């Protein structure tokens, strides 16, 4: 199937409480495989998936050097952006960055990404061409000029089309038993009377991987989008995910409702009903 690699960086200032914290996590699809936290007792890149453990000391040293350099770079960026928005030295602010590569089912580069945010708002993003930038405002335009002078987009394009795809393919091979295994959801429908006149039908999906799934309710073959309560997909803590969708139906009309499940682990989409 299709696979992606992403790094997620968070840099958080905390005036009067020390220097800004820098955290970086790395993912392959929905599997975290590395972490770095500048607040850790002795900051180092740590493994978070068993298939990354076979990487040698040169890998761990190289990652740690990069994240320690990022810790310093992001403290400078936080100072700079505070300046660009004429903000006071009193408030806490956050820079976030997410970047990485997407592969298609053939393992070829689909597209690259490199996006940054300030206080949870888009700030600057590398365009899909991997050559130009989209700056959100006049402050982000200042970062854009700096990045144009340092040839940043050219450096990112080289990385995204090169090392990013190369290392992602390596991880996919080393972790092929899990990363290239789709676990289909275990599905069932529960019934909960809410009154004499109505009952809740809840369609469950458990134990699936990756997190991407579609759970919908239909009444007489038509989608009940506005009347469906859909919870956010949530992690089980064992690599898999869970989700449910619920509809409040009139008593005696339960068999007019069907739950539809689509997942990569499913050859064909599933159709479920309440089984009394």
């Amino acid at each position: 199937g299709s696979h992606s690699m992403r790094y997620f960086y968070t840099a958080m200032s905390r005036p009067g409480r020390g220097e800004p914290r820098f955290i970086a996590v790395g993912y392959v699809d929905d599997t975290q495989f590395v972490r770095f936290d500048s607040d850790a007792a002795s900051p180092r890149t740590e493994p978070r998936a068993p298939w990354i453990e076979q990487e040698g000391p040169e890998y761990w040293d190289r990652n740690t050097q990069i994240f320690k350099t990022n810790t310093q770079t992001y403290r400078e960026s936080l100072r700079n952006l505070r300046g660009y928005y004429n903000q006071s030295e009193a408030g806490s602010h956050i820079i976030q960055r997410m970047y990485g590569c997407d592969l298609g089912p053939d393992g070829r580069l689909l597209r690259g990404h490199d996006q940054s945010a300030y206080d949870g708002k888009d700030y600057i993003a590398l365009n899909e061409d991997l050559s130009s930038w989209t700056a959100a405002d006049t402050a982000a335009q200042i970062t854009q000029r700096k990045w144009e002078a340092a040839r940043v987009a050219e450096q990112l394009r080289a990385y995204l089309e090169g090392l990013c795809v190369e290392w992602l393919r390596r991880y996919l091979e080393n972790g092929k038993e899990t990363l290239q295994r789709a676990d289909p959801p275990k599905t069932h429908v529960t019934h909960h009377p809410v009154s004499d006149h109505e009952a809740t039908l809840r369609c469950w999906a458990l134990g699936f991987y990756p997190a991407e799934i579609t759970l919908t309710w239909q009444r007489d073959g038509e989608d009940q989008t506005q009347d469906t309560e859909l919870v956010e997909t949530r992690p089980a803590g064992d690599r898999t995910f869970q989700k449910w969708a619920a509809v409040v139906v009139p008593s005696g009309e339960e068999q007019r409702y069907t739950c539809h499940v689509q997942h990569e682990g499913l050859p064909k989409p599933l159709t479920l009903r309440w089984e009394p």
């Binding site: 790094y7 970086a24 790395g26 890998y59 190289r62 990652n63 990069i66 994240f67 350099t69 990022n70 770079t73 400078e76 960026s77 700079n80 952006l81 820079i95 970047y99 940054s116 600057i124 970062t143 700096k146 990045w147 340092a150 940043v152 450096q155 990112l156 990385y159 090392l163 990013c164 290392w167």
Partner: peptide, 9 residues
Amino acid sequence: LPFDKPTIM
């Protein structure tokens, strides 16, 4: 593997 060049904003 992460990107290795600094990106001061």
